Every structure is written in C-alpha cells, then in structure tokens.
Design a protein around this ligand. Structure first.
Ligand code: HEM
Ligand SMILES: CCCCCCCC/C=C/CCCCCCCC(=O)OC[C@H](O)CO
Ligand SMILES: CCCCCCCC/C=C\CCCCCCCC(=O)OC[C@H](O)CO
Ligand SMILES: CCCCCCCC/C=C\CCCCCCCC(=O)OC[C@H](O)CO
Ligand SMILES: CCCCCCCC/C=C\CCCCCCCC(=O)OC[C@H](O)CO
Lengths: 156, 157
C-alpha cells in the first residue's frame, strides 16, 4: 500500500523540523544545565527523531489514502508545526517556559493524530505510539530542565 | 461542503505555531540597521497580513479536507506550514540570511504546490491560496534583497 509521492511529501515536510535540529545543536549552555537523573545521552536524540520522522511519514501516507482522512491530516499538520516550533524556542531563544507550553500543545496534537489515525487504520495508529511516548519524554525533559534550573532567569 | 468548525479550528490552531515565532520577536537593532528596499513595509504590516493569511489558508484547508482525494493536497499543506514555521527563527533568531532564503523558497514551492492541488479539488480553496502565494513571492523577494543589500557574516558550517 506504498504511495511514494505521498510518503516523500510527508518526509520532505519533516525536513523543516529536521533543519531546526541541524542549525541549533545543543552547546554547553545545554551541557551546563542540571539534567534529570534519567537524562539520555546526546546520541539518542538524532536516532529517535530520524526514526520518528520516518514512522510518522509512513503513518501519514497510509491515512492520506483513505476516505474521511481530513480531520486526521489536520491534526497531523498541527503536531508537525509545533514540532518545528520547539527547538528554536528552547535552544535558539532559551525560552524554557514558553517551550514547555509548545511541547505540551504538540503532545496534545500528537495524541489527537494517533487517536484519529486509529479510527481509520490500525497500523498508522500503532506507528504513532512511539511518537506519543517520545513526546511524553520530551515534555518531562522540558519540565525537568526548568525545575532543576529555576535559579536561571531563562527558566522562569 | 460546510463550514466545518472542528476542521477549521484545527487548521487555525496549527497556525498558532508560526504565529508564536512572530510573537517572540523582540525589536532587533540588527534588523533596523539592515538596508531595506523602498517597497519594504513597516514592521506592523507583517502580523496583520499573516493573521489574515492564517484564516484564509485554514478556511481553504477546511474545504479541501472534506473532499475525496484530498490526501496529496493535505500533505502539501503540512509541508508549507512546517517550512513557514521554520523561516522566522532562521532569519531573525539565528540571523542566517542565506539559509533563510533557501527556507522561504522551499516554503514558496510548497505553497504553490498546495494551491495547485487545491485548485484540482475545489476552485475556491485554490482562490483562497492565491493571496498567500502572492505574499510568499513578496516575502522571498524581501529575503533576497535583505541579503543582497547588506553585509552578511559567514554562517557556522
Ligand atoms: C518537540 C520537541 C523536540 C524536537 C522537535 C526536537 C528536535 C531535534 C532533532 C530533529 C534533533 C536532531 C538534529 C540532527 O539530527 O541533526 C535533535 C537533537 C537533540 N535534541 Fe531535540 N527535540 C525535541 C526535544 C528535546 C528536548 C526536550 C531536549 C532536552 C531537554 C532535546 C535535546 C536534544 C539533544 C541533546 C540533541 C542531540 C544533539 C547532538 O547531536 O549532540 N531535544 N532534536
Ligand atoms: C536536513 C536538512 C535538509 C532538509 C531538506 C529540505 C527539504 C527538501 C525539499 C525538497 C523539495 C521537495 C521535494 C520533495 C518531493 C515532493 C513529493 C512530490 O513531488 O509529490 C509529487 C506529486 O505527485 C505532486 O502532485
Ligand atoms: C496579503 C494580505 C492578505 C490577504 C487577505 C485579503 C482578504 C482577507 C479579508 C477577507 C476574506 C474573507 C473571505 C472569507 C471566505 C470564507 C470562505 C468560507 O468560509 O466558506 C466555507 C463554507 O464551507 C462555505 O460553504
Ligand atoms: C475536533 C476538535 C478540534 C479542536 C481544535 C483545537 C481548538 C482550537 C481552538 C482555538 C484556536 C484559536 C486560534 C489559534 C490562534 C490562531 C493563530 C493566529 O492567528 O495568531 C494570532 C495572531 O496572529 C497574533 O497576531
Ligand atoms: C486536541 C488538541 C487541541 C488542543 C491544542 C489547542 C491549543 C491552542 C492552539 C493554538 C494557540 C496558540 C498557542 C499554542 C502554544 C504556542 C506557544 C505559546 O503558548 O506561546 C504563545 C505566546 O504568544 C508566546 O509569546
């Protein structure tokens, strides 16, 4: 059920958030921050995001072939935009509290996309489960970055 | 084909992400120093124009999302919105004028693709995107002239 035009369009759309990561690698401002005890090493993040961009694009390709896809793809557009927004807010401007709001809104749209995907295609919904899990970890990391660095002005 | 509020509000909420990039822009002395073309509008014009476009593009997507075969058009729509969200941090936040030109040109291509695919399904949704493509052409020209008219420092390799 492989529609390559659809899949490559969704993958190309992931070039926008992928670009935020390439142009805003965490520096020692990030390394100096107090990390939660469960903080993963740096190499985990490019692995996780590359896999998720491929998985969410495959899921979107499947759903976009189905009747009644409209609302699910609207949710998909929404989560992707806030996904693109997060890195410049946290790593570019160091607005940690605003970034927490961003990742929480993204989380809601990721959950809505996954739910809407399950309504139309079980596999597309399953492909989004690791994304919702990873988005949960991202929200916790954003929260812990603020709670463990509250004496920094950029955390408040 | 109706005014579908779940669809429309979802697409409008999605434009909250690029709207946020604009909202977090403090007045910049580097931007005020830049040589601008005579046809550069004052700064207050941009949030007004983008707000109108967010409503226009969201209404267009709402109409298309109700139609069979919308998939490719909606995929184009997701792409244009994502690169739209990318542009402001690249130009104003990181001050990477050349990379921002590439971003806005990619956005332009996906805006053109969305409008074309929208026209294939619904003329009015395509019409609603025409002022967006016009604005995107104007935005690309401003990025091009800003780079052409000023000193540019090297970007980090
Ligand atoms: C919506 C949330 C997030 C998005 C969209 C995102 C995006 C990305 C992407 C795409 C990359 C890969 C860059 C590349 O492959 O060139 C990356 C790397 C990274 N990000 Fe995130 N990220 C998010 C959340 C977070 C959070 C919460 C943290 C930490 C508090 C974080 C810290 C990092 C780190 C440490 C790297 C590794 C950089 C390296 O290569 O050394 N990210 N991010
Ligand atoms: C990681 C940093 C690099 C980021 C990379 C930036 C994004 C690349 C954009 C390429 C142009 C778009 C090409 C993608 C292909 C579009 C799919 C397509 O053309 O669909 C055909 C359809 O039939 C039409 O009606
Ligand atoms: C570059 C500057 C930006 C350009 C901005 C200039 C125009 C904006 C003003 C008014 C638009 C009003 C048009 C509203 C069209 C609504 C269409 C609609 O709601 O129709 C859906 C429903 O299904 C029906 O059947
Ligand atoms: C199925 C149910 C789906 C529910 C969907 C979620 C509900 C979204 C509610 C309201 C969105 C309000 C509009 C979001 C903000 C619009 C973006 C904008 O226009 O920015 C403001 C302006 O530009 C500043 O200058
Ligand atoms: C089913 C899930 C639906 C629930 C999702 C609907 C959320 C509201 C959407 C857009 C509002 C725009 C703000 C969204 C968050 C942007 C980050 C922020 O809050 O910052 C705004 C401020 O303007 C920075 O200066």
């Amino acid at each position: 059920n492989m529609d390559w035009a659809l899949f490559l369009t969704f993958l190309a759309a992931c070039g926008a958030p992928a670009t935020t990561g390439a142009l805003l690698k965490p520096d020692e401002w990030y390394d100096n921050l107090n990390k939660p005890w469960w903080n993963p090493p740096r190499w985990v993040f490019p692995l996780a995001w590359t896999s998720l961009y491929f998985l969410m694009s495959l899921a979107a390709m499947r759903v976009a072939q189905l009747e009644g896809s409209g609302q699910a793809l609207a949710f998909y557009a929404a989560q992707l935009a806030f996904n693109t927004l997060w890195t410049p807010v946290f790593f570019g401007m160091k607005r940690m509290a605003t970034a927490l709001a961003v990742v929480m809104v993204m989380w809601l749209f990721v959950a809505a996309t996954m739910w809407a995907f399950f309504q139309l295609d079980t596999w597309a919904g399953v492909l989004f489960v690791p994304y919702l899990i990873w988005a949960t970890f991202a929200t916790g990391l954003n929260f812990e970055a603020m709670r463990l660095n509250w004496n920094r002005p950029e955390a408040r």
